[PDB]
Amino acid sequence: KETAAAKFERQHMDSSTSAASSSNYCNQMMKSRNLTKDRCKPVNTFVHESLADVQAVCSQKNVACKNGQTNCYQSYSTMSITDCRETGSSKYPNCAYKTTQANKHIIVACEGNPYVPVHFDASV
């Protein structure tokens, strides 16, 4: 099984580009990160900052998570992100996603030693 930190990296990190460069970014990245293997993952956010900047959020502002847990943290700065969400044309195995690029603060849940991101809760 994948560790929770490595699953967060695979699902949410895309440091190789500054921003989504096209409307087909999400169809390509949801496929390549293996988020459409047996079903289309409905919603997923990628963060276009270094892994170190995203890990650093775990020592920034502590805030509640949506589920009421207390180990979420909100980045002090906005980050470049792309949100991917399935469109009404999406039908597995032919998944199809809308790509929305934005600059937002991110909220992550952190756990472990090292204390690192294990879930993406939201952007603001």
Active site residues per annotation:
12, 119
Given candidates 95, 120, 121, 123, which one binds Cl ion under the rule CB under 5 A?
A: 120
Q: How far apart are CA 117 and CA 48, in angstroms?
A: 15
The answer to whether 59 contacts Cl ion (rule: CB under 5 A) is no
From 28-36, 46-54, 72-80, 98-106, span contacting Cl ion (CB under 5 A): 28-36
Q: How far apart are CA 46 and CA 97, in angstroms?
A: 13
Q: Which is nearer to a copy of itself, 56 or 98 (CB)?
A: 98
Given candidates 22, 32, 34, 50, which one binds Cl ion under the rule CB under 5 A?
A: 34
The answer to whether 123 contacts Cl ion (rule: CB under 5 A) is no
Asked if 107 and 69 touch (Cβ cutoff 8 Å), the reply is: no
| Nearest alpha-carbon partner for 47 in 2, 92, 81 | 81
From 15-23, 67-75, 85-93, 115-123, span contacting Cl ion (CB under 5 A): 115-123
Q: Which of the choices Cl ion, a copy of itself, none does residue 83 contact, using the CB cut-off of 5 to 8 A by kind? A: a copy of itself
Per DSSP, 66 falls in state T
Place of tokens 């409307």: 23
Where is the binding site for substrate, in residues?
Answer: 7, 10, 41-45, 66, 85
Residue 25's H or E segment, with its range, is helix 25-32
